[PDB]
Amino acid sequence: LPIHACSYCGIHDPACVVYCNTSKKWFCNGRGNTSGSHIVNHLVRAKCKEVTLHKDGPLGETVLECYNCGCRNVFLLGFIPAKADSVVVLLCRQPCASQSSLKDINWDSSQWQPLIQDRCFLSWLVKIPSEQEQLRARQITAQQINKLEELWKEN
């Protein structure tokens, strides 16, 4: 089982996993038996904010951070598409993605959208594991997560 396997379930598709900078562990973008996806569960429970994407994923090894100020809080970051072009930019909801800051010089502020929606990352950032790949993994519940998380913070 590879180093980048989800610390909850063991899914190891490079496109599906997300690295957590603070706790140095990988978590997938699938929801399993839980109501949120695994990284989001972790980021909420462990009280974490910063992540990195896999070398082999859609965006290569990228630390997700605000283009303007370098703030890395994933709960605040969102993306703005470029018009007639696919060279997206990542910015803080505030103040970096405001019409005060952007002034419509290079980016259209009204076009901002959170990186995390529906308690998980957008599929083009981190792909969602398939139906059968989620079945092959460890069928963990929300209560085992909470205990595993606590068993970790012991160390």
Residues annotated in a binding site for Zn(2+): 6, 9, 20, 23, 28, 38, 42, 48, 66, 69, 92, 96
At its nearest, how many Å lie between Zn ion and the CB of residue 40?
11
Of 94 and 117, the one with the shorter C-beta distance to Zn ion is 94
Contact assessment for residue 27 and residue 12, using Cβ atoms and an 8 Å cutoff = no
Contact assessment for residue 39 and residue 27, using Cβ atoms and an 8 Å cutoff = yes
CB-facing half-sphere around the CA of 153: CA atoms within 13 A? 11
Of 58 and 72, the one with the shorter C-beta distance to Zn ion is 72
At its nearest, how many Å lie between Zn ion and the CB of residue 55?
19
At its nearest, how many Å lie between Zn ion and the CB of residue 35?
14
* CB contact set of 138 (below 8 Å; sequence gap of 6+): 8, 9, 10
Residues that bind Zn ion (CB under 5 A): 6, 8-9, 11, 20, 22-23, 28, 38, 46, 48, 66, 68-69, 71, 92, 96
Of 69 and 82, the one with the shorter C-beta distance to Zn ion is 69
At its nearest, how many Å lie between Zn ion and the CB of residue 38?
4
* CB contact set of 147 (below 8 Å; sequence gap of 6+): none
The C-alpha angle 38, 40, 46, rounded to 5 degrees, equals 95
Of 84 and 115, the one with the shorter C-beta distance to Zn ion is 115
Cα 121 to its chain centre, rounded Å, is 5
